[PDB]
C-alpha cells in the first residue's frame with residue numbers, strides 16, 4: 817500500500833534527523849564535548865513498537881536543552897516531535913518504563929537510530 821510507504825518515509829525522516837544530530841557531535845571541541853557527554857538520558861526498557869516512540873518524545877526537552885548549550889535546536893526538536901506524533905498517533909496510550917542506567921547523548925541517539933532502522937526493516 818501507500819500508507820505503509822508513508823510510515824517508512826516518516827521513520828526515515830526521524831532516522832536522518834537523529835543521524836544528523838549524532839554526526840554534529842563529531843565536530844564539537846573537547847571542553848564542550850566533555851561536558852555534553854555527562855548529561856544523562858533515560859532509555860526505555862523496551863522499544864520495539866511504534867508506541868514506544870513516546871519514550872523518545874518524553875526525552876525531547878532534555879535533548880533540546882543540552883543541544884542549546886552546545887551550539888535552530890528548537891526547530892529541529894519540534895520537527896522530530898511532529899514526526900514522532902505522525903508515526904505513533906495520539907490515540908495510543910502508553911506508559912514508559914525506563915532502565916535504571918542512564919546513557920550519554922551518543923548512546924541515546926544510537927539506540928533511537930537502531931529503533932527506526934528496526935521498524936523500517938519490518939515493513
Ligand SMILES: COC(=O)[C@H](Cc1ccc(C#Cc2ccccc2)cc1)NC(=O)C[C@H]1CCCN(C(=N)N)C1
Nearest residue numbers: 848849851852854855856857858875878882885886887
Ligand atoms: C543531576 O543532573 C546531572 O548530573 C547532569 C548535569 C549536567 C548539566 C549540564 C551539562 C552540560 C553541558 C554542556 C554541553 C555543551 C556545551 C557546554 C556545556 C552537563 C551535566 N544533568 C543530566 O544528567 C541531564 C538529565 C538530568 C535529569 C533529567 N533529564 C533527562 N534526561 N530526563 C536530563
